[model samples]
Target: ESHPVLEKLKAAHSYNPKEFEWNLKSGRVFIIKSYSEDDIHRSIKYSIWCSTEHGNKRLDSAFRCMSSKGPVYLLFSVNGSGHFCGVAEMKSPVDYKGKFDVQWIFVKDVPNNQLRHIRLENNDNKPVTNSRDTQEVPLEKAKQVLKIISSYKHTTSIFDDFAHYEKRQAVVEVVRKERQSRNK
Candidate 1:
């Protein structure tokens, strides 16, 4: 495949949604270039000499890598819950667009059910715990739902190998739908 764009990928941080913010995680908010100046030069040199000499997949994978105009999100899980955001986007909405995907890993410890029941209640009478504290709103319920796991004490986090770009777009779609419905 020989992509040559692999060098552009800055090393992203370890995947841990609640465990690490994007800066701490070593990920960037978005990728505008296809390669890094140093990384590409080194990798290219390595391939020319080490194509078969050192024989780690580094050369091969580097050649096949995809350079993106956007950053890749990292995936992680905690107490059976998991999610994705650009390793660079995990900090706060102020840090980035706060647009990323989350993947729930194994989810045995985190309950999938009622994750948002508190936020979805009828009104202030049955108001959600710590509701409307941030940019969250009756309008932001979905965003808040996406953030609850981060608001609590999480036990563990692991990288999800399956985190993909498509999942993030799905979240955007759902939020868009909720917004439309709310406005009506």
Candidate 2:
């Protein structure tokens, strides 16, 4: 089932429907690991995949290589956690801020034990063993991850949540500016 929030965001951005359709046909899936659960929560709430400053280089390169063909799918996992937390369709290439516009598709906690045997590989066919936050998954492996979580809950109303979050942040910014002006 298509999500309303995702549809609204896509429409707002003027994303071509055909591109997402093509993505469903043949897009690369990736594993993006967050350092903490709070980071995953932020990602789910905002519908964004943010990378660390050092990690952005690799993520950007991957985006450049794969984004032209279709939207990039990212499965979220927390470092040292034995489970995957969520999944999203990365709506655009990595921006200058080291973030990807995203449409969160699924939100559930599933153990990684079932997927332990599947290795996430890089372009060189070797296992990704570094500290990089993003790693490409082979199509077959990606299918397994999707299948495991297919029965779980899909994310809903993320756009509304993001709107609230933005409003709160805006208020915080205004408060900080006001205090600074008064102190000056």
Candidate 3:
């Protein structure tokens, strides 16, 4: 199976969460839209197209993506008729309200005459190190788990997965009860 993080990053311009992936290994954040005339300047914007409905799947995957690898978050907005991209380190876990709940180090964009490009270096003039700040699952086990979780051909809903798990657990209990009765 392909790494979902990298794949989401490859298509960050789309609002569809199942279609967008942002592996922040490379220092490029693609802008997806330009500002309309009615757009407000100096206003907070949604860089990733967050969902307005149930479960905000794209945002959910974004949280997972940041946790597993990146530690980087890229969002896009348009101000003064030009596209602007914001970069920040994943300082805290994504909150219940889909907000950035931790301290973030914002990357500055250098204004070169007119066009501003995002720069990811620190004020100390050093590249941000990719340290696994959190304890990561073992590499082999992680991949094995991914393989098993994705083994089914018709897994489309989290609720469905849970139901399947519950059924399996029920079957095990039944088998165990039968074995105990036979030994009595």
Candidate 4:
């Protein structure tokens, strides 16, 4: 079944809903750090989230934990952006390529200052840190972050532009193949 948000995106842009397959489960929520806007844009464009594995045991363990529980939602923390930029639901396990499929539900820029003040249930109420590549957020804290995302009036035009580019590229690829076949 197609997601309502994705359906709306298709109507507004040249998005293909067939590219996404949902394996969503109401499990945990994780904040994945992106060092640059390009990285975030690539993920949105391809509907895949990629992270470095470079022997980072912490990140490896986090993926293992997430895999065992169920599919989870991901919130993107972009470096120097001072905000959690987007939220996506996972559609597959982290494969050998260190990437996983995602279906983005929301792509908006919002401040992260308020997130710093959110107290987790454990860790003695200390705020979560973005130092790690991936970290699990308590359900309560996740709710607060979602609240911030919903309350903000940020634009998702950047993500929309990526989607447009992706659609256009697909069209170009098909046209190129057709021309090559005709020339043969």
Best by lDDT: 4
- Please give, for residues 77-184, the per-residue lDDT of candidate 4 as tens digits: 776677777778777666775777787766776665666878666556666544345667777677667666656677553554555555566787899999999999
lDDT of each: 0.29, 0.63, 0.31, 0.65
Query: In candidate 3, where is summed lDDT lowest over 10 consecutive residues?
Result: 126-135
For candidate 2, report its TM-score: 0.61
Residue-level lDDT of model 3, residues 1-184, one tens digit each, is 4334324533543222332223224222212132431211111222223222233344345456656554433333333423222323334444563443322122122222222222223223221111111212223332332232223232122222333444565687899999999999
Ranking by TM-score: 4, 2, 3, 1
- Tell me model 3's lDDT, rounded to 2 decimals: 0.31
**Candidates ranked by lDDT:** 4, 2, 3, 1
Question: What is the Å distance of residue 65 in model 2 from its true position?
Answer: 3.3
Lowest summed lDDT across 10 adjacent residues in model 1 is found at 91-100
Most TM-score-accurate candidate: 4
Task: State the lDDT of candidate 2 residue by residue for 1-184, as single tens digits.
Answer: 4446545655555421222232155677777888876566567656777787766677677668885786677777778876676677877767876787787766656665555655565445443222236677777667766765655443432343545555566687899999999998
Task: After superposing candidate 3 on the true structure, give the runs of residues whose Cα lies further than 4 Å from its correct spot.
Answer: 1-56, 102-104, 107-184
Per-residue lDDT of 9-32 in model 1, one digit per residue for the tens?
Answer: 222322234453223222121111
TM-scores of all predicted structures: 0.22, 0.61, 0.28, 0.62
What is residue 74's positional error in candidate 3, in angstroms?
1.2
In model 1, state the lDDT of residue 29: 19
